[PDB]
Design a protein around this ligand. Structure first.
Ligand SMILES: [Fe+2]
Length: 349
């Protein structure tokens, strides 16, 4: 069914759970996917490997879940009970898939706890305010249910998020392409092309990696990585998406690609504004303590401020104002971030 791909074991890091720390990611900038073979040390809480799709139906209830018909490349709404009924059907007609069942507001929500590293890095988890007019983005806990021969074409995850993905049962195969400027250009071209779902994108790039994720294993995909997924065995997985401060330019690049392409990280800009205010404080506090900020934070801080100026230009503002929180003074924030960055970069002190 498939083709021949490049060796994942040449690019993909395989640390233990305990080795996967913030400092570990700060050293490599989280540039490559990370496969942890054994969940020990990841800080997760999971149901038993005996846990099944039938077991899921118990907690979420038979709630209208969104399902993807891969066969006819179409999306539709169906009851969860009926999906399970199709799932355990020994004569499967269609090839249906669930990759959008976000369950953090359900009863299942207290059975799963995401990786520790994800909660430490996550913008929403750490920096989204208790009180504001906006709905909190809840994209941290998805229950994924895929049948044999399920596929998702090459894509970048919404909002330029990073992903974590734990296979509880079965297997998933990821086809992974690095988000270089060239690949991203080739990708944006291929995506907005007419009859996009005819051409195979992994042929267009220098390198495409095949990564198998088997039972008990956890994959972390960094910002902007282009990936397709094959399900060669019926799969039950848990996973989710998050933003962080290690590759802010990449997050903004990825975000703005889906802008030009025209499913979405809700209030993406809103969280950036809050993060900009936080990053301003980190800078101030570090300067007053005679300490220099990490290099990636300066880079990211600059990329953030560039986006802030672009969103707040006269010609752009109407498309962006509704995401600016009232608790943020735009011009002052931009001015203050710029000064702190200049002070760190100005060679005369
Ligand atoms: Fe994805």
């Amino acid at each position: 069914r498939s083709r021949t791909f490049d060796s994942s074991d040449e690019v993909i890091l395989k640390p233990t759970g305990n080795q996967l720390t913030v400092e570990f990611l700060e050293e490599n900038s989280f540039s490559v996917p990370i496969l942890v073979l054994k969940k020990d040390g990841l800080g997760m809480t999971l149901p038993s490997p005996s846990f099944t799709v039938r077991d899921v139906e118990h907690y979420v209830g038979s709630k209208e879940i969104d399902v993807i018909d891969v066969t006819r490349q179409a999306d539709c709404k169906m009851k969860l009970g009926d999906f399970v009924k199709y799932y355990y059907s020994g004569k499967r007609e269609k090839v249906l898939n669930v990759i959008s069942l976000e369950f953090s507001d359900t009863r299942l929500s207290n059975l799963v706890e995401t990786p520790k590293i994800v909660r430490k890095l996550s913008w929403v988890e750490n920096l989204w305010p208790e009180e504001c007019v906006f709905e909190r983005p809840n994209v941290q806990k998805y229950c994924l249910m895929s049948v044999r021969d399920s596929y998702t074409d090459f894509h970048i995850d919404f909002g330029g998020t990073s992903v974590w993905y734990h296979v509880l049962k079965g297997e998933k195969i990821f086809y992974l392409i690095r988000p270089t400027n060239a690949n991203l250009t080739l990708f944006e071209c291929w995506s907005s092309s007419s009859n996009q779902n005819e051409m195979f994108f992994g042929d267009q790039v220098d390198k495409c990696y095949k990564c198998s994720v088997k039972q008990g294993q956890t994959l972390f995909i960094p910002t902007g990585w282009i990936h397709a997924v094959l399900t060669p065995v019926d799969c039950l997985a848990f996973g989710g998406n998050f933003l962080h401060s290690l590759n802010i330019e990449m997050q903004l690049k990825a975000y703005e690609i889906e802008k030009r392409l025209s499913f979405r990280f809700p209030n993406f800009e809103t969280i950036c504004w809050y993060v900009g205010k936080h990053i301003l404080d980190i800078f101030r506090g570090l300067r007053e303590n005679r300490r220099h900020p990490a290099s990636y934070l300066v880079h990211g801080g600059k990329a953030l401020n560039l986006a802030f100026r672009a969103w707040t230009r006269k010609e752009a503002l109407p498309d962006h104002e509704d995401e600016i929180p009232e608790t943020v003074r735009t011009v002052q924030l931009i001015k203050d971030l710029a000064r702190e960055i200049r002070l760190v970069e100005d060679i005369f002190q």
